[PDB]
Amino acid sequence: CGRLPDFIAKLTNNTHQHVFDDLSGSVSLSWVGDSTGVILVLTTFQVPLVIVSFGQSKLYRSEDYGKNFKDITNLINNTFIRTEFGMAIGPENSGKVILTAEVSGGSRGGRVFRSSDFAKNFVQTDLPFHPLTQMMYSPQNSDYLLALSTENGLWVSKNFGEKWEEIHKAVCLAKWGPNNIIFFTTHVNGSCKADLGALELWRTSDLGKTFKTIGVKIYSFGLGGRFLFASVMATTRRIHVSTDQGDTWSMAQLPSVGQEQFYSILAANEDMVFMHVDEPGDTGFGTIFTSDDRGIVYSKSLDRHLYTTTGGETDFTNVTSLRGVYITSTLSEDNSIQSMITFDQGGRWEHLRKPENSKCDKNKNECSLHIHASYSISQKLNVPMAPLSEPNAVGIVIAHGSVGDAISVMVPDVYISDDGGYSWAKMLEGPHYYTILDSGGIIVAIEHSNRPINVIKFSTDEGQCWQSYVFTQEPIYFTGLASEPGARSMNISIWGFTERQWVSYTVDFKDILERNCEEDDYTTWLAHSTDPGDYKDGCILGYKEQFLRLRKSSVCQNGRDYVVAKQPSVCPCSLEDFLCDFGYFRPENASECVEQPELKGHELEFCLYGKEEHLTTNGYRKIPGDKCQGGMNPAREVKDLKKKCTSNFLN
Amino acid sequence: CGRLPDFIAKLTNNTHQHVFDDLSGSVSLSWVGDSTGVILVLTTFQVPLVIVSFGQSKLYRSEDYGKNFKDITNLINNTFIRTEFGMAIGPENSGKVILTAEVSGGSRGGRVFRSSDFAKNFVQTDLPFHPLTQMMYSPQNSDYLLALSTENGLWVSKNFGEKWEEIHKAVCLAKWGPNNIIFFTTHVNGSCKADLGALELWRTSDLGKTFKTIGVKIYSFGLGGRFLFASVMADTTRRIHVSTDQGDTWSMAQLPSQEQFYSILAANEDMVFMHVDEPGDTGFGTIFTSDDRGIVYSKSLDRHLYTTTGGETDFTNVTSLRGVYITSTLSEDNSIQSMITFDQGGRWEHLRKPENSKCDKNKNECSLHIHASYSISQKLNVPMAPLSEPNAVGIVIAHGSVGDAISVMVPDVYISDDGGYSWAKMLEGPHYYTILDSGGIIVAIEHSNRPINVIKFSTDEGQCWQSYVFTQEPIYFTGLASEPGARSMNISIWGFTETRQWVSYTVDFKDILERNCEEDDYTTWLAHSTDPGDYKDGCILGYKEQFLRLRKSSVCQNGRDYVVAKQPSVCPCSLEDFLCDFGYFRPENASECVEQPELKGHELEFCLYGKEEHLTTNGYRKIPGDKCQGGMNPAREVKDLKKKCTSNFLN
Ligand SMILES: *[C@@H]1O[C@H](CO)[C@@H](O[C@@H]2O[C@H](CO)[C@@H](O[C@@H]3O[C@H](CO)[C@@H](O)[C@H](O)[C@@H]3O)[C@H](O)[C@H]2NC(C)=O)[C@H](O)[C@H]1NC(C)=O
Ligand SMILES: *[C@@H]1O[C@H](CO)[C@@H](O[C@@H]2O[C@H](CO)[C@@H](O[C@@H]3O[C@H](CO)[C@@H](O)[C@H](O)[C@@H]3O)[C@H](O)[C@H]2NC(C)=O)[C@H](O)[C@H]1NC(C)=O
Ligand SMILES: *[C@@H]1O[C@H](CO)[C@@H](O[C@@H]2O[C@H](CO)[C@@H](O[C@@H]3O[C@H](CO)[C@@H](O)[C@H](O)[C@@H]3O)[C@H](O)[C@H]2NC(C)=O)[C@H](O)[C@H]1NC(C)=O
Ligand SMILES: *[C@@H]1O[C@H](CO)[C@@H](O[C@@H]2O[C@H](CO)[C@@H](O)[C@H](O)[C@H]2NC(C)=O)[C@H](O)[C@H]1NC(C)=O
Ligand SMILES: *[C@@H]1O[C@H](CO)[C@@H](O)[C@H](O)[C@H]1NC(C)=O
Ligand SMILES: *[C@@H]1O[C@H](CO)[C@@H](O)[C@H](O)[C@H]1NC(C)=O
């Protein structure tokens, strides 16, 4: 590293401290918009919903990037905010902020505080109901809001929460869809919890004027990517998939008929669907399945995928910093925990490579790096944050990791990856709260412990070289860490307390990164490919692209994109460009899809929209979203036998 | 509170410190037996069950009342303990301690470390299975142990964990019964979570040689008092069946009011408290009280709050005064109240606000809400449930908040010296507390983020408190333990600093209480009665007794019981000595049971063991356990009719 710039003098002039006198309850801090100036500090209280309580939430606004906060509590006089609700921030550049509150004395409805100018000016609005869930912006229109009342009434607002109109009265759960479509379940008898398995799923495209019952005997439903899900009670629970907003459905097809199992949707996008199916009976870990572009035909993707028995949380992770990369945890035959990583969107999984920082070697199960995610959070392990990545910060992945030793499981370490998870390196000791900013230019981290802290660990070279910085002589008990939005942001905000009086610390890094990076500061790198050969070194699902990376200890402000230029180029297909077909799987550290043993010599059939099909394949099919052309082109054929099996438990 | 005796000198010589070097993971501490001087300190690790990990738990033992601890880790080396298991301490005089462990490298089964001499000498025994749950002693015999394996197998041991024998293989939940009877549920298809509502309840009296399927279509089952409960699925509808003869004959619970949700709050040798959720799951239900057979219930309390996910309530049984119970309800203003009964659920009143209320601005404001399991489930800052002891007659210590949302975030510690009738705020902020010396000493420790070093104790039943600095190096509090015994004077605190180094502090109060109390140290008091007149002031279910209470700032050792040892005089019956009969209820602040509106002009019929009965009552029935004679005695009569209904879905 050899970092010798006097960072103390550059940061001391930029360390803006603001003391908040006597804040009771949980304190929330949020930057509002990029390059706006607006920082909100809200006071929240943990209070049961239906209980009417007295209280006054304190609100402070800064319009000068954390330098001075103005007390604007009179805006929300005689109201208070609950912790589970908090702020309702709209999409990027929408400038919309909703503050759902409750009247201090009590009322016949809630009260919101609405703003469209990046929280610079709020307006008061009395709700004709008490909200059960938080306001939900529509992905198509930020002016449209749906909410659920304490009386299970569905309320819609067309004008950014000013006027609300109830559209149904027995709603259990409502979610936005594409093009302002609202999907919601309703019941008739008693309660929602008593009629689980006997619910009706309705659709509305007119914001409450037209309805269409698209499903009966519904247990639950969800949206993911271009797919609509619904668990239907056949008693037996089966997952049905719809891509046409619920007009036509199709039952999910697995290479087996495992009755009364437990199904779960890990993730889904505009290409495919990740499904987690629990192992039969109560054995623990399940098996991941990958679907086609229609989300109907699944195949075994990864065996022994761990999950939490009560909750169902897994270590499945979306590497947002590199396309097609996903990381999760599995259990080996030695009953040790491993971290599996795929670079081809679930096509082939391989073990996570142990860090180059070799400080280690059933002794082989030891030294295996386990990246903690939602499964580790549910197991009550000391993991303060899930894996964090950003699309702007291409290749940067920061997360907690442990070793096979139970001591390292009790105290995980912070690992940094600059190639999307292919290689790792221990950079920080102990658990930390971290964030990414400046499109990956600055990475901050704060110690997570019981003692008060006062040290900022940051890095300007994408987490390659770190250096500490004391930002206060009065240590504070850490509460939260926030960053300014935008691609060229350079500020953070830390707020904590002593013993109890609160205080915030806003740090500017503009003086640290005084020089703009040049071509002698950027080293390039290519994404990892499971197949050998220089022809596809750097190809990501059939698309080869080049990426930039700051050199070690590069103290400079990067104002460029990490994807270089356009340069469209197609790669030839290979093993990494094809999923295993219906009834096929890849053995451990293998590159060929063999056929499942119990399916050899049988009729490969699966009911596709109520019509049976016969599959004749070599064991491969194209990955949904893969744009490879040429090279490997295996032969597969779907033969329509016109024989009809019932695969739709909906009207 | 004119307390000026030098507490520093008496406690400093009795404050014994011991430091533990290089401790990783959670730290448990337990006194082993009364007047034995044995203290165990165990290191536990939070590790998933089916995952085989490497680790070593450290074990320390003190045999001189916490003055010196000896490292005895070599006894349990190459093994580790999970935090969810910990120690398995038997009854007080049993001297039995079980240490369920897991082999550091992995094995075919767990390993236990058994001791019968108050943890003075342990023996090693390899289990033929991996335990899913902790060892369960039997109430009839401490030598009998049942455990549940990771493969849902039920194992029993007749000789204190020395030899184990499996008796069933598809068990979902097992519980001990009276006289070593074992009740357990089993399935057949798939898993236990999928067979909910279709389970078989079996009985065993010979530790696994003979069986008897006493129930079919079972959803759940539990034990309480002299009653066995079983949630039976009729169609689909879930109904509760009560059995007093260990499951040989059942009888469905009869209530004055479809597909609702039932819950068992508490159960005695006399009656049963039953919670029934209102149709809609709006967060509140109704408490029902039964007869001596636990069949005929009646509306005892309306709008009883419960957690929607979990079903926990604020129902608290004041063990320090017979027939007193405290729970939380929801008012018509949707504010939370604490209701208290002094006649075992016959009549409920509002908890009286403390004297000289600091909040004295509104009517619903200033109301005291005692926190219990419901507040714990609401994720409120309540470290302990209400604490009381039958030895410490009348003493109740609990956390309480006000109508303000700030007070809910930081509840205060309230003390009652009359079983819950009157209260007073004694300590600011949450605390961990304990009772000692049969009520002579009440210790309390501040709960916060900062390190602590103060012991708050009271010798006059919590009327006057005094702080005590037990260390110059403050520690982060972890746990507070007490030596068993009616005349115990020792406590054990253990915490850490900042790596992280642990330390324990054992404090003896023998020198504080050097004088035995005398006649001018005790002030007499009578229990509270809802009915007016001096003829019933002090009656508890027909028995009037006089209780003793230490004067304010009474620094002395209690020599006699707080109850004047006589034969108590019998009280004449009145309205407070009668429950509301089947189909009746008491309105708010009303002492007369009026008939339920929807039942006026109908045949009050309830199926008693498959046979109809006709109720002709004035609206009252004697409380099970009330021994009053004379006074009021309204007429009621149960005539066996000719109709024979079906009130049993079991065979
Ligand atoms: C992080 O916060 C700082 C403030 O501490 C943001 O820097 C910028 O602060 C300057 C003043 O130092 C504002 O610049 C301008 O001042 C000139 C006169 O000197 C005036 O003519 C302009 O109208 C403007 O007020 C500047 O607007 C402010 N910029 C932002 C984005 O708020 C800093 O930019 C923040 N982080 C980043 C890099 O976004
Ligand atoms: C409310 O809390 C009290 C706290 O003690 C519970 O205490 C006790 O419950 C036990 C078990 O039924 C009673 O013990 C019984 O003693 C009689 C003596 O004749 C004996 O024959 C029985 O076999 C049993 O051991 C005990 O009397 C009772 N409380 C006291 C100390 O008076 C009580 O169960 C809880 N209330 C409810 C409704 O569950
Ligand atoms: C709370 O802990 C203290 C110790 O810190 C206990 O006081 C101790 O009482 C025991 C009684 O067994 C004394 O033990 C010794 O017993 C042997 C038996 O042969 C005898 O030879 C010794 O002369 C001695 O009596 C021990 O010395 C004594 N320690 C102190 C400092 O008082 C106390 O009993 C515990 N609390 C309660 C209420 O039991
Ligand atoms: C998170 O996973 C999703 C897939 O589950 C990825 O989704 C697409 O990412 C690309 C950019 O790499 C976007 O252009 C698409 O709009 C995303 N949505 C789709 C196809 O559903 C996503 O890349 C991962 N995280 C991020 C934001 O990079
Ligand atoms: C806040 O509202 C209350 C009404 O509940 C009013 O009495 C009070 O004056 C208001 N305070 C301010 C500063 O406006
Ligand atoms: C258990 O302790 C013994 C010494 O008491 C030690 O030699 C051994 O290495 C430990 N366990 C194993 C098998 O490693």
Author numbering:
A (entry chain B): 53 to 286, 290 to 416, 420 to 557, 562 to 713
B (entry chain A): 53 to 287, 290 to 311, 314 to 416, 420 to 557, 561 to 713
Question: What does the study report here?
Answer:
Sortilin can trigger internalization of ligands from the cell surface via endocytosis and sorts ligands between several intracellular compartments, such as the trans-Golgi network (TGN), endosomes, lysosomes, and the secretory pathway. Sortilin binds and sorts a broad range of ligands, and dysfunction of sortilin has been linked to a wide range of disorders. Previously solved crystal structures of s-sortilin revealed that the Vps10p domain in fact consists of three domains; a ten-bladed β-propeller and two 10CC domains (10CC-a and 10CC-b) that have substantial interactions with the β-propeller. In this study, we detail that sortilin undergoes a conformational change within the three luminal domains and dimerizes while transitioning from neutral to acidic pH.
